[PDB]
């Protein structure tokens, strides 16, 4: 499984982009972010979004350090998250998942490997 490396200073915040894009198919999407480390798995946030500019309906959220970005810009969509107040324990793989459940397609997903580093 391919993963993009991203780095962030301890105690700061990181924007984790969801880059799913669709001209005419960004409609009533189900989404989920997950976290994986060696022997850890968590669902971080889950919900639905009506379109590219609507208020996402969040049905599950593991931690208030996570917020949705609240905007779109180029390839970063409204499903992207910001994780604040970073701790070394936050290092690990963060995966977004998007699906239109009325369609037959496989889910779309990509993984970011976040590494938290020492403050200077």
Curated annotation (Swiss-Prot):
It is linked to Long QT syndrome 10: A heart disorder characterized by a prolonged QT interval on the ECG and polymorphic ventricular arrhythmias. They cause syncope and sudden death in response to exercise or emotional stress, and can present with a sentinel event of sudden cardiac death in infancy. Atrial fibrillation, familial, 17: A familial form of atrial fibrillation, a common sustained cardiac rhythm disturbance. Atrial fibrillation is characterized by disorganized atrial electrical activity and ineffective atrial contraction promoting blood stasis in the atria and reduces ventricular filling. It can result in palpitations, syncope, thromboembolic stroke, and congestive heart failure. Expressed at a high level in dorsal root ganglia, at a lower level in brain, spinal cord, skeletal muscle and heart. Expressed in the atrium. GO terms for molecular function: sodium channel regulator activity; transmembrane transporter binding; voltage-gated sodium channel activity; voltage-gated sodium channel activity involved in cardiac muscle cell action potential. Regulatory subunit of multiple voltage-gated sodium (Nav) channels directly mediating the depolarization of excitable membranes. Navs, also called VGSCs (voltage-gated sodium channels) or VDSCs (voltage-dependent sodium channels), operate by switching between closed and open conformations depending on the voltage difference across the membrane. In the open conformation they allow Na(+) ions to selectively pass through the pore, along their electrochemical gradient. One of its GO terms (cellular component) is plasma membrane. This is Sodium channel regulatory subunit beta-4. It comes from Homo sapiens (Human). The gene is SCN4B. It is found in: Cell membrane. A voltage-gated sodium (Nav) channel consists of an ion-conducting pore-forming alpha subunit functional on its own that is regulated by one or more beta subunits. The beta subunit SCN4B is disulfide-linked to the pore-forming alpha subunit. Interacts with SCN1A; regulatory subunit of SCN1A/Nav1.1. Interacts with SCN2A; regulatory subunit of SCN2A/Nav1.2. Belongs to the sodium channel auxiliary subunit SCN4B (TC 8.A.17) family. Coiled coil: none annotated. The chain holds residues 36 to 155 of 228 of the full protein.
């Amino acid at each position: 499984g391919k993963a993009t490396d991203i780095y962030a200073v301890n105690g700061t915040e990181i924007l984790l982009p969801c880059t799913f894009s669709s001209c005419f198919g960004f409609e009533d999407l189900h989404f989920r972010w997950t976290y994986n480390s060696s022997d850890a798995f968590k669902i971080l946030i889950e919900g639905t979004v009506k379109n590219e500019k609507s208020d996402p309906k969040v049905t599950l959220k593991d931690d208030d350090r996570i917020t949705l970005v609240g905007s779109t810009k180029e390839k970063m969509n409204n499903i992207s998250i910001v994780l604040r107040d970073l701790e070394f324990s936050d290092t690990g793989k963060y995966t977004w998942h998007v699906k239109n459940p009325k369609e037959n397609n496989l889910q779309h997903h990509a993984t970011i490997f976040l590494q938290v580093v020492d403050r200077l």
